[PDB]
Design an enzyme around this catalytic site. Structure first.
Site, mmCIF file in Angstrom:
data_model
loop_
_atom_site.group_PDB
_atom_site.id
_atom_site.type_symbol
_atom_site.label_atom_id
_atom_site.label_comp_id
_atom_site.label_asym_id
_atom_site.label_seq_id
_atom_site.Cartn_x
_atom_site.Cartn_y
_atom_site.Cartn_z
ATOM 1 N N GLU A 1 -1.306 -8.566 3.076
ATOM 2 C CA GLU A 1 -1.272 -7.657 4.208
ATOM 3 C C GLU A 1 -1.686 -8.320 5.517
ATOM 4 O O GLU A 1 -2.468 -9.282 5.517
ATOM 5 C CB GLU A 1 -2.111 -6.390 3.935
ATOM 6 C CG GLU A 1 -3.618 -6.623 3.848
ATOM 7 C CD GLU A 1 -4.478 -5.378 3.960
ATOM 8 O OE1 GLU A 1 -5.547 -5.462 4.609
ATOM 9 O OE2 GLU A 1 -4.092 -4.326 3.399
ATOM 10 N N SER B 1 -5.710 5.643 -0.779
ATOM 11 C CA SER B 1 -5.740 4.184 -0.839
ATOM 12 C C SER B 1 -6.951 3.677 -1.617
ATOM 13 O O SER B 1 -8.042 4.191 -1.444
ATOM 14 C CB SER B 1 -5.729 3.593 0.566
ATOM 15 O OG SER B 1 -5.850 2.181 0.521
ATOM 16 N N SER B 2 -6.742 2.664 -2.449
ATOM 17 C CA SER B 2 -7.768 1.973 -3.232
ATOM 18 C C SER B 2 -8.421 0.948 -2.303
ATOM 19 O O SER B 2 -7.731 0.028 -1.855
ATOM 20 C CB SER B 2 -7.128 1.225 -4.404
ATOM 21 O OG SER B 2 -6.147 1.996 -5.082
ATOM 22 N N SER C 1 0.860 -1.197 0.000
ATOM 23 C CA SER C 1 0.000 0.000 0.000
ATOM 24 C C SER C 1 0.898 1.250 0.000
ATOM 25 O O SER C 1 1.826 1.319 0.808
ATOM 26 C CB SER C 1 -0.920 -0.004 1.228
ATOM 27 O OG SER C 1 -1.815 1.099 1.176
ATOM 28 N N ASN D 1 -1.680 5.356 2.970
ATOM 29 C CA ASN D 1 -1.881 6.043 1.701
ATOM 30 C C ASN D 1 -3.077 6.985 1.793
ATOM 31 O O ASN D 1 -4.158 6.552 2.125
ATOM 32 C CB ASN D 1 -2.051 5.000 0.568
ATOM 33 C CG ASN D 1 -2.151 5.541 -0.834
ATOM 34 O OD1 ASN D 1 -2.156 6.757 -1.092
ATOM 35 N ND2 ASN D 1 -2.358 4.636 -1.768
HETATM 36 N N1 LIG Z 1 5.054 8.014 -10.235
HETATM 37 C C1 LIG Z 1 4.594 8.818 -9.271
HETATM 38 N N2 LIG Z 1 4.749 10.156 -9.419
HETATM 39 C C2 LIG Z 1 4.359 10.963 -8.425
HETATM 40 N N3 LIG Z 1 3.802 10.641 -7.252
HETATM 41 C C3 LIG Z 1 3.628 9.312 -7.144
HETATM 42 C C4 LIG Z 1 3.982 8.355 -8.082
HETATM 43 N N4 LIG Z 1 3.576 7.093 -7.671
HETATM 44 C C5 LIG Z 1 2.997 7.314 -6.516
HETATM 45 N N5 LIG Z 1 2.998 8.628 -6.130
HETATM 46 C C6 LIG Z 1 2.476 9.206 -4.886
HETATM 47 O O1 LIG Z 1 2.288 8.192 -3.908
HETATM 48 C C7 LIG Z 1 0.893 8.076 -3.562
HETATM 49 C C8 LIG Z 1 0.553 6.618 -3.413
HETATM 50 O O2 LIG Z 1 0.532 6.024 -4.725
HETATM 51 P P1 LIG Z 1 -0.559 4.933 -5.168
HETATM 52 O O3 LIG Z 1 -0.607 4.602 -6.615
HETATM 53 O O4 LIG Z 1 -1.957 5.365 -4.639
HETATM 54 O O5 LIG Z 1 -0.237 3.629 -4.326
HETATM 55 P P2 LIG Z 1 -0.936 2.204 -4.263
HETATM 56 O O6 LIG Z 1 -2.016 2.116 -5.327
HETATM 57 O O7 LIG Z 1 0.219 1.186 -4.502
HETATM 58 O O8 LIG Z 1 -1.407 2.062 -2.825
HETATM 59 C C9 LIG Z 1 0.156 8.823 -4.673
HETATM 60 O O9 LIG Z 1 -1.188 9.235 -4.404
HETATM 61 C C10 LIG Z 1 1.140 9.946 -5.017
HETATM 62 O O10 LIG Z 1 1.122 11.016 -4.071
HETATM 63 MG MG LIG Z 2 -4.076 1.881 -5.183
#
Ligand SMILES: Nc1ncnc2c1ncn2[C@@H]1O[C@H](COP(=O)(O)OP(=O)(O)O)[C@@H](O)[C@H]1O
Ligand SMILES: [Mg+2]
Ligand SMILES: Nc1ncnc2c1ncn2[C@@H]1O[C@H](COP(=O)(O)OP(=O)(O)O)[C@@H](O)[C@H]1O
Ligand SMILES: [Mg+2]
Lengths: 760, 766
Positions: free
Chosen positions: A447, A199-200, A149, A196
């Site tokens: 998790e 978070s999804s 996450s 996060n």
């Molecule tokens: N390539 C990226 N560029 C900029 N910020 C990023 C990038 N990847 C992630 N982030 C940051 O980290 C946060 C968490 O990423 P996210 O895709 O929601 O994680 P996950 O889906 O694995 O839980 C994002 O909302 C953003 O702030």
């Molecule tokens: Mg996600």
């Protein structure tokens, strides 16, 4: 001479071996002549001669091991280079800041039709490789985006979809409709968690569909396990779904009044979590004072580089209108959101008994009025359905049972709303027929917490099944091909987890069916379910009682109060309380009839022994997903979370190394380096050049023309290897392999000419 | 009320519950006031009110559990009643003495055409049920006789064959021929082991074939995995195959001299095992003094109620002559046996630096001469083939062998010659009862029984892998297919979950990664190593439920075995720790070309007929897997019947019922689980439609107008059956255990019988 040896926070540190013992090495750390520490021989690794350099593909390192991998991705990360290959697999380290222009339309164009390795590592290249394989091999593709996450899975999934739709979509309202529909999915399915801010709380598989001409015809979103408990209660540092806050912060005064909304602290379903908005100095000025909770006025706004509750509301509404949702549809969605909020504000008090059961408190009249109006229900019908129940006989409910009926109704209404939103999104980009698809998988990894419940159980079940797929595709099928071709590649082994999957999903005796049995019994009990699991799985290796745990915090958990599942990724102790309740997706017929007979057409359409298994419904969805994955060509992106603080330029070596280990990336470093990711049969290569070859070349056995062709192109015997029927190209040779495979008639003639010159 | 509680040696003991704790029950044993012990609630069972009684079918007990099963079996055993049912499955406890007249020709006749339950439990009733099913259902049958070594499998297999041939044969010597050929198979395939004086060192499936009239036309014996290592070496308490001792003790002086035989202590292939004969006061007097080894003169004869080396030789020779083997054939067999013995007496010595090889010792000249003469070989050709190996280099060339390699070439030649002799004997026996064509067969399976010793090798590994496979067939047929049928018929029978033994099969025979395939890989490598093979097994099967390193053993005798020197296989019948030394050697059935060519080019027509630069390799394990899969296809295509043999003690004594030992077999065999499932099982079933259609031309309009189920209900009620005895499903009617007699009467298609029952229905229909 300097080596990599363990370091508690950096993962590894540079040192020199000064002594050896059985099972041990004495290490002197760099620029510390005299001081020493011990390390197990298998924990010490050769280091690259040049410590300042970085390689784009980890397979290029002189010594590929966990320590050199960690250092290479560290050096790249310090130069804001978040992407690095392990042959055709991508590693993506979350930057936690926007790196300038790396996702620009200009960057998109520069990756189009470029072979792996021709351009720096990037998610765009993984997306392009999947397109080319689909286009050439006439086979649907899957891109699996994995990680913990906050690792960056959702962000990299968006980059893939934007790349494919922008590149292979003509540029049309239809083409943008896949990218533009996303703020809608996140508003209803994402929430602020401690790990996060976005978070999804649902898993997804997004398919981009193509015609015969390899052009985008439309798409399809599959969704999994929306987190129901979050709808009603959240921790003090967490929030409910974004939609509630976006609507509270951004709605017009006419919308706020029609929905009887106010600041988030006024709703039970929000005021137990964090009621603060995501805002900056500018957007906070756009949020009216009447929308602001006391906590928001005291503590200020929540900080995030992109999330903004006011801005996200305007963006969401703009996206809705662009993809085809009218205002009627938009207002219908908001009405249900508000209805769910007012529902949570209904409180109960014990009735005088005499007559048993409970009554709505007189202070809950206004909430009842608002909820019934927004849900198109009769006030007294709702009052009756929340305080009584039918079972043959109508019986009153106690306060606690009424609170539960209210929460079940809210979770079911909201979940049905989310299903409607996913279906509505699918309706924006439909297609009559498609040839192929490129599917992107974005779902929560393995998790565990202090207390593990049904939610963790379901997710970890998913990753036990996905893990089997990862092992079979990367290890079993790849090494089997090398064997059938007699390549003599060193064998890398894996523990088969079919029994772990069997424990959970076995018919009748599987945990899911034992749990289903419990829900269909006259007196359903979590203890009885847990006993039936332990009685039906006595000798089982994967199943253990909580009292057998390594951690002291579990030793007081009773035999009938939990179970330990020995998952592939590590043992997880589950507390089985509420497993029976959480396993039921069905609303009790008394509440079901009430909501199905709503005055509102929209509400009725959300719902167009009461028991529907959550676990078995999920198993059926998971098996369908797994059939699609198994039938497609697969590409992998491993996302890495650099720290636990959401900060940029904070590479936590030990934390990153643990993810590289746990993901299984390390265990496959030698397989992938000594492997051959590109291959083609001698006969297909020969047949493609046949009409262009002169007799001198045509007379040769296919194997020999291939040999002649590779040598004429300046390829060395190290770069490729001839098997029994196929030729194999090593990592870092994708560009050269794609040149050999190019079917363009001018290109086939040009290479035949090179061969003719080499033969003279 | 008294209950069954655990006892370390009796399995269970009778007691009274005096207290209860969070996980325990305090038990006061019988007639021991004041004294108590704790038992888990799950380990205490209700007992039958009457402790002196016994029931013929365990399904009749008021309380069906492991403790009541054990006690019922015990009481019957003390009254010399070795047979007890669990519905249509038979349990047979080895009496270790001859119970009078229970296998008589008179007892045979009394079981003919009698339904299960109409006569006391007996192997004859299982054999009759298989015959009736074959005749009625027009389907071949199989009778599976299971159990560990010394349980009684071979004896019960003989009783089945004698019953079927005596009952359903011509009446001439042709039926007896199948039975009369057996002393020949045992002489060449049985040997004295520490667990059984007459242990079967090969598995067999004996088919009795029938014509359309359900009369015996002939038979066919299939044999599996004769034990090779026994031919050359045996432990001090064990012997080589019976034939060697029968021939040494019983042969005439002219035969002894022509074969250059003497007392067993003079042969390497016998003198490492026990060289004592099985004899009594009388038969010892018939054995000449020159046949007696020093050990026999000191320790005396070996004791057994039936085995007798002198007597068994005379009986074997009498049987050979009666079934049609002439003296020429008989002497040809003896010649090969003696030739194998003389071969073992050939010793080797280092040749020196010039050639880094070996020479035959000068003291081995006489053995070489005798062996070459009996095997029809040239002396120098045999000398050369035992001390050299042909290699490619592309000129054909010989390379000297070291002493150890020449001892191995000699032993490989002996094992191959003897194995080929056994195949000839099985074929010769098949030639005694052939048949042009048959309609159906009744097959009896007698495999080598599950066995373990102080030291477990490839032989045990193969035996136990086969014992495993037949437990899987039992699980599939009795515990899987049965419950699936009840489900498909919507009977709502309580589901019984058993620990499956498939995972253990997978570990052994799985393609590529299976132990059998890894072992073949090792034999195919330039430098084959047992350690390398054992490592590959442990590396490809990490954390497997059925695989474990030897130091994880419960027994102290296995804790010093290295990781690469063994493995623990968790068989259904108990964990077995295998020493993997010589697994590579024992896995090769092939003889090196030099030795093969030498024996195929013999001067003797009989020897040649026994036998019809590249690596000489034929997998023993994969050849066996292929035989077992073929056998399993045959078993799966037939109706199956089961006999579960039980070994009562470890001392071969009569009237010594060891409760704990017996209980363990009842547990490991799946009988404890079968009993559970019969609390609501239905072993007899038939389509009510097929039943209605059979009586339709005989039934009057009043019954014909009725739905098939209703005529069936009328018929069952007219026959005095209660609603508890039967149950209707979607397409079939099912009958509870103990109702076989009544079900067979309902199923009888004889037109006079059909009319007679319709008359009973008409009388019931007032
Ligand atoms: N390539 C990226 N560029 C900029 N910020 C990023 C990038 N990847 C992630 N982030 C940051 O980290 C946060 C968490 O990423 P996210 O895709 O929601 O994680 P996950 O889906 O694995 O839980 C994002 O909302 C953003 O702030
Ligand atoms: Mg996600
Ligand atoms: N029913 C029986 N009646 C008499 N003796 C028996 C009986 N069953 C077995 N035995 C004795 O026990 C010995 C071992 O029996 P056997 O059938 O050879 O066992 P298995 O083949 O299962 O290893 C026999 O040689 C015989 O002495
Ligand atoms: Mg036997």
């Amino acid at each position: 001479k300097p080596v990599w040896a363990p370091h508690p926070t950096d993962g590894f540190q540079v040192g020199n071996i000064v002594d050896i013992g059985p099972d041990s090495l004495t290490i002197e750390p760099l620029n510390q002549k005299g001081k020493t520490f011990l390390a197990l021989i298998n924990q010490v690794f050769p280091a690259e001669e040049d410590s300042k350099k970085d390689v784009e593909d980890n397979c290029s390192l002189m010594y590929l091991n966990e320590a050199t991998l960690l250092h290479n991705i560290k050096v790249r990360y310090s130069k804001d280079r978040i992407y690095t290959y392990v042959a055709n697999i991508l590693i993506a380290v979350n930057p936690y800041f926007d790196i300038p222009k790396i996702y620009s339309s200009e960057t998109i164009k520069s990756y189009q039709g470029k072979s792996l390795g021709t351009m720096p590592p990037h998610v765009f290249a993984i997306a392009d490789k999947a397109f080319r394989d689909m286009k050439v091999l006439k086979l649907s593709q899957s891109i699996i985006v994995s990680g913990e996450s906050g690792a960056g899975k959702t962000e990299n999934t968006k980059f893939v979809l934007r790349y494919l739709t922008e590149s292979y979509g003509t540029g049309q309202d239809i083409d943008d409709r896949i990218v533009e529909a996303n703020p809608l999915l996140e508003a209803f399915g994402n929430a602020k968690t401690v790990r996060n801010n976005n978070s999804s709380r649902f898993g997804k598989f997004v398919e981009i569909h193509f015609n015969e001409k390899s052009s985008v015809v439309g798409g399809f979103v599959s969704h999994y396990l929306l987190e129901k408990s979050r709808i009603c209660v959240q921790g003090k540092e967490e929030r409910n779904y974004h939609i509630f806050y976006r609507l509270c912060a951004g709605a017009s005064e006419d919308i706020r009044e029609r929905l009887h909304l106010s600041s988030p602290d006024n709703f039970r379903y929000l005021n137990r979590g964090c009621t603060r908005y995501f805002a900056n100095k500018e957007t906070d000025k756009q949020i009216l004072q009447n929308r602001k909770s006391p906590e928001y006025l005291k503590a200020g706004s929540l900080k995030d580089p992109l999330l903004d509750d006011h801005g996200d509301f305007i963006r969401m509404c703009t996206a809705m209108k662009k993809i085809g949702l009218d205002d009627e549809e938009k207002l219908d969605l908001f009405r249900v959101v508000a209805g769910v909020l007012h529902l949570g504000n209904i409180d109960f008090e014990e009735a005088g008994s005499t007559s048993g059961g409970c009554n709505l408190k007189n202070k809950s009249t206004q909430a009842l009025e608002y909820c019934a109006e927004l849900l198109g229900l009769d006030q007294d019908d709702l009052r009756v359905s929340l305080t009584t129940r039918v079972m043959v006989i109508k019986v009153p409910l106690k306060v606690e049972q009424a609170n539960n009926a209210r929460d079940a109704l809210a979770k079911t209404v909201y979940s049905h709303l989310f299903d409607h939103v996913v279906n509505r999104v699918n309706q924006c980009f439909p297609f009559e027929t498609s040839s192929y698809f490129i599917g992107v998988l974005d779902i929560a990894g393995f998790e565990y917490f202090e207390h593990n419940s049904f939610e963790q159980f379901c997710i970890n079940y998913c990753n036990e099944k996905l893990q089997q797929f990862f092992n079979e595709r990367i290890l079993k099928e790849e090494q089997e091909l090398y064997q059938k071709e007699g390549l003599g590649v060193n064998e890398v082994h894996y523990v088969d987890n079919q029994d772990c999957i069997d424990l959970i999903e076995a018919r009748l005796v599987g945990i899911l069916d034992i749990l289903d049995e419990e829900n269909r019994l006259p007196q359903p009990s979590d203890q009885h379910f847990t006993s039936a699991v332990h009685q039906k799985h006595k000798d089982h290796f994967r199943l253990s009682i909580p009292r057998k745990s390594k951690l002291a915090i579990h030793r007081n958990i009773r035999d009938d109060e939990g179970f330990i599942i020995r998952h592939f990724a590590g043992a997880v102790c589950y507390e089985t309380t509420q497993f029976v309740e959480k396993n039921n997706d069905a609303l009790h017929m008394s509440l079901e009839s009430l909501i199905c007979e709503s005055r509102d057409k929209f509400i009725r359409e959300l719902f167009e022994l009461s028991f529907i298994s959550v676990g078995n419904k999920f198993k059926t969805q998971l098996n369908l997903l797994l059939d699609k994955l198994r039938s497609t060509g697969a590409s992998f992106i491993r996302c890495i979370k650099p720290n636990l603080k959401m900060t940029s330029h904070h590479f936590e070596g030990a934390q990153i190394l643990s993810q590289l280990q746990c993901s299984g990336m390390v265990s496959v470093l030698d397989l992938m380096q000594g492997g051959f990711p590109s291959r083609a049969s001698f006969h297909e290569l020969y047949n493609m050049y046949k009409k262009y070859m002169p007799d001198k070349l045509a007379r040769l056995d296919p194997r020999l023309f291939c040999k002649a062709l590779f040598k004429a192109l300046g390829l060395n015997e190290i770069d490729y290897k001839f098997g029994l029927t196929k030729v194999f190209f090593r990592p870092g040779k994708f560009a050269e392999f794609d040149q050999i495979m190019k079917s363009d008639p001018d290109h086939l003639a040009e290479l035949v000419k090179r061969v003719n010159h080499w033969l003279i």
